[PDB]
Amino acid sequence: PQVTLWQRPLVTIKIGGQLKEALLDTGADDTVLEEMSLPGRWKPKMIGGIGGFIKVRQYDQILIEICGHKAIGTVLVGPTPVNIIGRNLLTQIGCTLNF
Amino acid sequence: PQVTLWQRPLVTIKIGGQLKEALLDTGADDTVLEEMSLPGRWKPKMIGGIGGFIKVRQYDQILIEICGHKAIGTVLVGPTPVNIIGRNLLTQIGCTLNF
Ligand SMILES: CC[C@H](C)[C@H](NC(=O)[C@H](C(C)C)[C@@H](O)[C@H](O)[C@H](CC1CCCCC1)NC(=O)[C@H](Cc1c[nH]c[nH+]1)NC(=O)COc1cccc2ccccc12)C(=O)NCc1ccccn1
């Protein structure tokens, strides 16, 4: 699709068999979702945002469906104000900015 | 232009005949520029994101040019490490996300 920015670019994602809403965020290097139990192994990690550094859990090789397009990659789980799809997954689904 | 997301979407903006680098961010409701001394009265504001909130100064009707495209609007000045172009200015130039 072609998504305009008059509103927040929120889409439906499917992960862990759950539907959630997530923001497409090109200012984000990685994908950060709110607290959820994902299957497998995780490793603690620190990330920064405009407010500072937070701690997250890192899950590798997670399948996520974004607007029905499949992505397999890293997901950080932590205290984010919103579910955000960063560049690691935007590139997998061949998302671009245009003007 | 068609900006890919393999790298951070950094472009050149011009602000009062000053060229600067800015990240094009679809996950940003507002535009945030690095600390700078703009003539004018501002209004204090607090913006949030990963990590919490920071205090910024709000200036209205600032003219910026994103890759030779004029946008005039509300800008927040705070201690960001980078200039961030948000949705408020991204819509004025025709920016869309495509996948
Ligand atoms: C900051 C702009 C804007 C004001 C704000 N938007 C956000 O904070 C977005 C969402 C959390 C909503 C946010 O992801 C945004 O895209 C920011 C932009 C970033 C600010 C730091 C400087 C570089 C650029 N990105 C992020 O916060 C992600 C989080 C992440 C994932 N992996 C690693 N980090 N950061 C990054 O990818 C890269 O970070 C950094 C890179 C280099 C230096 C840094 C120094 C300090 C801190 C961070 C640095 C907003 O709209 N907030 C209102 C709001 C919206 C929805 C919900 C609640 N509140």
Curated annotation (Swiss-Prot), chains A, B:
Changing G16E: Confers resistance to lopinavir, ritonavir and saquinavir. Changing I54M: Confers resistance to amprenavir and lopinavir. Changing A71V: Confers resistance to amprenavir, atazanavir, indinavir, kynostatin, lopinavir, nelfinavir, ritonavir, saquinavir and telinavir. Residues 1-5, 49-55, 88-99 are annotated as: Dimerization of protease. Changing L89M: Confers resistance to atazanavir. Changing V82S: Confers resistance to lopinavir and ritonavir. Changing L90M: Confers resistance to indinavir, lopinavir, nelfinavir, ritonavir and saquinavir. Changing A71L: Confers resistance to lopinavir. Changing L10Y: Confers resistance to atazanavir. Changing A71I: Confers resistance to lopinavir. Changing S37D: Confers resistance to indinavir and tipranavir. Changing V77I: Confers resistance to indinavir, nelfinavir, ritonavir and saquinavir. Changing K20M: Confers resistance to indinavir, lopinavir and nelfinavir. Disulfide bonds: none annotated. Homodimer, whose active site consists of two apposed aspartic acid residues. This is Protease. It comes from Human immunodeficiency virus type 1 group M subtype B (isolate HXB2) (HIV-1). The gene is gag-pol. The chain holds residues 489 to 587 of 1435 of the full protein.
